[PDB]
Amino acid sequence: KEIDVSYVKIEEVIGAGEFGEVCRGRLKAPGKKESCVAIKTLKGGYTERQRREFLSEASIMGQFEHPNIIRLEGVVTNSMPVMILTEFMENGALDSFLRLNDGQFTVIQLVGMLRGIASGMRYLAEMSYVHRDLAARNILVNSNLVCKVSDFGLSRFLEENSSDGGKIPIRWTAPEAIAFRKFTSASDAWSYGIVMWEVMSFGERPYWDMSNQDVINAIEQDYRLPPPPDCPTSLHQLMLDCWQKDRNARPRFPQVVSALDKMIRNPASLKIVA
Length: 274
Ligand SMILES: CS(=O)(=O)c1cccc(Nc2nccc(Nc3c(Cl)ccc4c3OCO4)n2)c1
Ligand SMILES: [Mg+2]
Ligand SMILES: [Mg+2]
Ligand SMILES: [Mg+2]
Fold this sequence. Notes:
Blueprint: E1 8-17, E2 20-27, E3 35-42, H1 48-61, E4 72-76, E5 82-87, H2 94-100, H3 107-126, E6 139-141, E7 147-149, H4 175-180, H5 185-200, H6 212-220, H7 233-242, H8 253-265
Antiparallel strand pairs: 1-2, 2-3, 3-5, 4-5, 6-7
Helix pairs in contact: 3-5, 3-8, 5-7
């Protein structure tokens, strides 16, 4: 959806993205009430391939409609700067949000966040969309603490292309996906387990100061991240289920959502901690 630039008012720069700024603004179109939007801008000094790469995130987002997937409002392409407009998520990225609020949300709140993420992924998997970069930094959070999946793009990672998407995010990535570049919804399930750990650790870095190769070797040698402080054992076990070496043994997203919904219904089960 092409958005007339006169409909857009940019209010403040709130972030930086790969190709330029991220801003908060307002969108007002004839016949509709004004709404708050995030705006990614792409200014001069870019190649056409880069412009197409930029806008591809819009194309992809525009293919989806789900309350736990960032909603596209439109694009500005017939003037400068080139812009992508989405719904505005007041609390930004989940990892930084949790770090800011370390220890200040209950287990049930955190499980609700995880459920929202899992429902977003359930939807993507149903649509045969493999995310490939599922990580707490790519989950955005609104004023009601609703979590939505962001970061959409289909570019092969640097390792998949010519000898001579960015690099594979090793700490989030399933071992078969690192080794063979086989990215499936089941490798996304591995990543989801990492996101669970991030959330229950209030945004600690997965594997602390281990090197990428240290992480690769540890996982091959049966190491798995331990339960975060005060983490319910049932959640840690769901993480371990997500981190099965055999991708076919991992829960699919409908099962993940089901598991989390049961926890929510039976919050006594979450009292058991190591
Ligand atoms: C807490 S805060 O108000 O300071 C704040 C900081 C950064 C981002 C957001 N909030 C935020 N809300 C929605 C989207 C985005 N970033 C984003 C993505 Cl991830 C992908 C595509 C597009 C985006 O903006 C438009 O096109 N960000 C809010
Ligand atoms: Mg990505
Ligand atoms: Mg990415
Ligand atoms: Mg801590």
